[PDB]
Symmetry: C3
Subunit: 223 residues, 3 copies
């Protein structure tokens, strides 16, 4: 894809909700159709049919698949064979090997565990990689913690550490850098603060979970 | 050991003070009997006899030995042969090789130098490792600095950087993560702040230097 | 050189301004004569003649050359052959290989790109390296960003992350650690804050762009 030519506003859309695909695509620069956490276990088969029967522009759509080694991932790759999509987002990306095994597709590696952070440069360097993203929620969960943000709302240090790690790793290997979702959708002040910072430090994209976030991201990345 | 089954409150006890061993063990989840800085050069021989003649429960006790390559470390390992202890804490841990050479014992690697930080993942991955700890005092000392904390009491950036480095490295390799000692014992406010943060980001343990710290650690790690 | 014996106040002096070399050397502990950004494309040939015809004490002077693989770097190394200088500062240092290729000279590697940060330990370990420096301006520029500092004047997280990375990498390999320039020359409050922090965490040097900065650096590093 020409991912860098598309704007900074990427938007997750659960793949079991095809009646929303068209609105997502007109609201966003790029849509991430999601087969992992946006979709309940029981509705994943249905998401996979929707992925095949309701297409979006493949130059502006990526698919978030399930994690390395899972049965769900194998079922997802089977469903993708029926589409025109070329670019997948790998959750819980923990090794170069997990990226390589997705060739010949392009991969955005979403690093949200300790192992992924420690191996960030190896992941970024892997031949299929075209982008690196980070997520604070599952990072804190898999570390054994309870809260990604302190009381005043700033990320805790380890999240801030991983953020920089992934920005550097992506940029060292010429990859797109994607900043993490702002989970408090109505907190537009917080999102503006993060997206302006993201833009200023050289993130390419801030990923969004609701269409209302897109304008604020696009404005933050203006100059 | 089943270190994860024991609580979050670990407590250093100088090994030259056997009259205190029993009180330490009833106050703490785990006791670290110390052969390094808690004991003066001249009293180390005596600590080593105390280590042999006054035993603690080996399921709930670890021994802090001296650093790699030192004569003191060799004398410590000789004294440990006479005990039931299985798990040692290696100060100034700087390489996988320093951990490997302690096999077949289990090792908590205490990283408190630049080299240890740079090599954190290699240290964490080493087969004997069961835990990773960090210490800010000797990190700053060996870097050539003078102060681990700024005027408002927060750690300086490099300490905060090492903290996250060791949390990630431990968690990437399935190891226990131990947060650094709060040296200002009477500053219970500061300890509560650090331990609640430690718990929230997935530290398993906060290490203590005085029995009064244990309750505050155990409460911070509650939920 | 005996770089550690010289003071903490290093000062850049554009190499096209030889009428200023003597004043720079009396104002500073060490002078960095600059062939890269302090000198415009058209004046570089002239800088190189000045470097040869107006000598400074080689025990107290280093030369900032141009980047790896550039024609300018090759012209710089040709000009240096005519001098008594032994120690060069490599901008945009990105690999051990870029340092090795400068042997047998001593090298201060100035890390100011993502690749340099990711490869910091490899760079520090390289045999010619005697020092590591970082720069926030070109780090942010090459990452694709616009601002190294937030509104309240603190560095953005990625700069703070690289700072610590380079301090650790230098110290892990016994190298001098050089803290980044304070670009707002008249902001002596900001420089004092950074230099006192630098000194406290074990930086050896804070690099300066104007002679007025030297006293404030030397006082910050006192004890």
């Amino acid at each position: 894809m020409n991912l860098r030519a598309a704007g900074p506003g990427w938007l997750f859309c659960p793949a079991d909700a095809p009646e929303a695909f068209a609105a997502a695509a007109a609201a966003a620069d790029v849509v991430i159709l999601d087969l992992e956490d946006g979709v309940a276990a029981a509705q994943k088969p249905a998401a996979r049919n929707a992925l095949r029967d309701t297409p979006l522009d493949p130059e502006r759509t990526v698919v978030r698949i399930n994690a390395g080694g899972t049965a769900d991932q194998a079922r997802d790759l089977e469903a993708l064979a029926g589409t025109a999509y070329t670019t997948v987002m790998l959750p819980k990306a923990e090794s170069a090997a997990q990226v390589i095994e997705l060739a010949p597709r392009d991969v955005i590696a979403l690093v949200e565990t300790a192992r992924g952070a420690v191996c960030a440069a190896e992941i970024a360097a892997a031949d299929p990689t075209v982008g690196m993203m980070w997520g604070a929620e599952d990072l804190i969960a898999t570390l054994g913690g309870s809260s990604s943000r302190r009381a005043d709302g700033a990320y805790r240090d380890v999240a801030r550490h991983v953020r920089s790690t992934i920005l550097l790793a992506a940029s060292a290997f010429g990859r797109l850098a994607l900043d993490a979702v702002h989970l408090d959708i109505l907190d537009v002040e917080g999102l503006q603060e993060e997206a302006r910072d993201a833009a200023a430090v050289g993130f390419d994209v801030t990923v969004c979970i609701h269409p209302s976030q897109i304008p604020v991201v696009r404005k933050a990345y203006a100059a």
